[PDB]
Design a protein around this nucleic acid. Sequence first.
RNA 1: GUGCUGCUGUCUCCCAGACGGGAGGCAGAACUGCACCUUCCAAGAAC
DNA 2: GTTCTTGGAAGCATATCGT
DNA 3: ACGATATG
Length: 908
Amino acid sequence: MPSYKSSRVLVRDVPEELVDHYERSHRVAAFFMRLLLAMRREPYSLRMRDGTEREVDLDETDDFLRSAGCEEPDAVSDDLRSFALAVLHQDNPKKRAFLESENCVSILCLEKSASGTRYYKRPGYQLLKKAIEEEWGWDKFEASLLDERTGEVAEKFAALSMEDWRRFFAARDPDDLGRELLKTDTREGMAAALRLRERGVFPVSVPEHLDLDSLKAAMASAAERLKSWLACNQRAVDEKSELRKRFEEALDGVDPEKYALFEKFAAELQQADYNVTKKLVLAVSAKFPATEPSEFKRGVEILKEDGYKPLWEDFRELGFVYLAERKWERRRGGAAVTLCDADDSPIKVRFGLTGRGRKFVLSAAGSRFLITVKLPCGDVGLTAVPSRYFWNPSVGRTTSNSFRIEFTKRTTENRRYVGEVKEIGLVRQRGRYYFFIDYNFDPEEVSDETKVGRAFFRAPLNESRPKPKDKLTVMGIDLGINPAFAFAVCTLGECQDGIRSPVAKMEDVSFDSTGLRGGIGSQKLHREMHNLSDRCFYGARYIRLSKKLRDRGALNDIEARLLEEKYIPGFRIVHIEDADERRRTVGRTVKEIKQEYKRIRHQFYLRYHTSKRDRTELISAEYFRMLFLVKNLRNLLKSWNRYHWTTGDRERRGGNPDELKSYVRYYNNLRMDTLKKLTCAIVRTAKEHGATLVAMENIQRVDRDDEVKRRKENSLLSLWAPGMVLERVEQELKNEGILAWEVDPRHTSQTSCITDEFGYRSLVAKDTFYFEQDRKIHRIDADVNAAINIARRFLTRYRSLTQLWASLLDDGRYLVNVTRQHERAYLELQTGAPAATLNPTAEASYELVGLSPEEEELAQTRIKRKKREPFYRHEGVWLTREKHREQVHELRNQVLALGNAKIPEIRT
RNA sequence: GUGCUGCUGUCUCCCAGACGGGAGGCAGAACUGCACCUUCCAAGAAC
DNA sequence: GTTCTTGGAAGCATATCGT
DNA sequence: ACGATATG
């Protein structure tokens, strides 16, 4: 719930006393992870050190329960299951037995304990009893418990019988009803545990002994890991049940006898050494009496008509059902249990100030942290190697059982930070010892005016919400690849000069400051990153074709043309007809590609290590191009290592577990660095301008009508999942006190921000956008225009809609489908009714007319005629896709005829 | 401290199979640059 | 060639009896 | 006051 940040410090050597504690803690943690799973009478799977999944059947779990101390782990199965469910938090969140999963150690791993007998905190009972006993009227208590409540806690404390509870209170400050409540409000888990102790199963035998705090830390880590495993396993079971449902759905749609005949066909085809796959099913479904390509003749041309004529017309759906069944039969039935290991899957050996783990004293001196750990054996003083994250630390103890640290995070700026440390954690990574300083952090307050403004601006026009009522500063973002970031900021109360934009129910605002960020830092390096990436992309295809050339002599016609038209030119090579020589030429080409990759990578490293340092930028397009080059080189190398797959199209999965490990590592690390630097740039631009509210492009959805952001080689979606990017930028803008919203990008890249009409984005000068103003042709930067459009959409609350879907009623009219509340708001404001239809006009356009609610059913009577259709807005009329592009093409032919010289430029 | 992140020399293990590729270790030289919540986890996709 | 929108586990509070 | 369980 709180805010968190962390970094690791390096402890050079740790005495043998702390080493032994680390290993014994890991041992006990593994023991608990094993014991909780065992307590469940449910088989599971383990990921062993070498990757092979064992299946621990009930035998090994029963033997483990026996070794742990249980004399007969057969009849006590149900109580153990209840306890396991309780400790892993699979119980009622209100009646939860163990709010923290480490509260169970004392009842389990100790001889003398009082769990389940103490009652001083169970409900508010004791506190309320003493409070009323502190000279407060019982009528007030009864009222506040019965009728003054609407959702308060007092309602949920009252598990007792009121007609008898209000008879107990006659006695002064009693505890008899307290014991009654203790034995009445039994939580199932703790009752099961008490039954187990009385039975004689508990105080189980632990591994190498430790004090209670170490046991609590081990239990916490084990419980965390097992709860993650349970969540993953539940999702796995859900997906497999969904697959079974899909199999049932597919099977219900065919004749079972025909499905059995198709099963016979598939079995015989497999006996013919052909495994059933979507590709061959589709190939066979093309034309049964015809001849399939050479890739399928061996398996098809000997079985296609051998008694399987009856299912020729149904082969398609029958193959679909067979594929569904064979997918369900092979998808994982569960998720394997990764298990704790001091060197293979370390846990955090944790130290806390309130019982969880053993205490520690965090100290600083001479620019380095001095950690002190109160191990049972004694006291251990460690010196941490200086860190530039926590530079020049200072630390003092607060009166809240916490340490307050003030430090400098080294950057261009050297801002001081302040956070609180309450838990510290050990870990052994690549042999060395580290401490995870997880520390708390309080961001900026975020003013109430900002929240009012956000609620106002994100709402549709048909929802009344209070006005911003303040001089907010809103800024837009347009995320991209080449220009990673473009912005435009307005002050919401001033229109001194610049591009103007309406604001909902306020004066007009001006985008005084607009800019471009990112872009090409160096031209040559970007061009070479682009070329070398293209070679790898096409090289893998050349390898794929060469392999099946060597296997089957000649390609099919179309795939052969692709080799000459696309692959050979784009993967510089002289195509040798000989099969043997193709290996050696391909290897030589891969050698050249690796040398070029090394050169480019070195130049990219000289960013910060040449006198040109000062002219580099926090983020440049090279980051994004370098990610694509790495991604494509991974594919090319993976194809080359797989060249000798003689079978040509048969699977040999498994093999090397590392392979291109260095390239995957580099890809992930460079992605992380790029995302971090990008978000730093956005946040710093926002702060420099005071943008307390930030409108953002919603990359989750792609505008199909755009030509730049739609393709694979230019999309951010190809490097990250869209959710991972905006969430990171959203979070730290918040941490700096800036609230941000996501706006739909539909037609923002191809609609004017001065005018409201469509235009042209150049296919050659990709960074320019053309439109018409005063019937003169002007141009602007295609990315600042997108930012202004996003901000304008945020500010006007989506007043102007550029696209509308419709369906063709047979009358010759189109009915508008409304599903987003912005559509309803627009259709209401422009016409006056919730729904409307587009009526043709003689000038080859359709006009909105609006409908009364009654005729909606009449329109629905015919709406089923056709599919959804797109319609686009121009100069106050609406026109169709085939004619929308015509108007854009007219502007295209006009611009190429006019030239850049006669075109004025808008400022940016 | 973790990355961005490399170079020279040099040793070792794998897949080729005589064209090449892929895990790692060790010793040097060049630069004092830019960022930094981590941990635990199994656009690609349909026809 | 023509279109569409991965989630989970964690990173401590305070109360009370006895010296 | 502070320490050792105990459990929101």
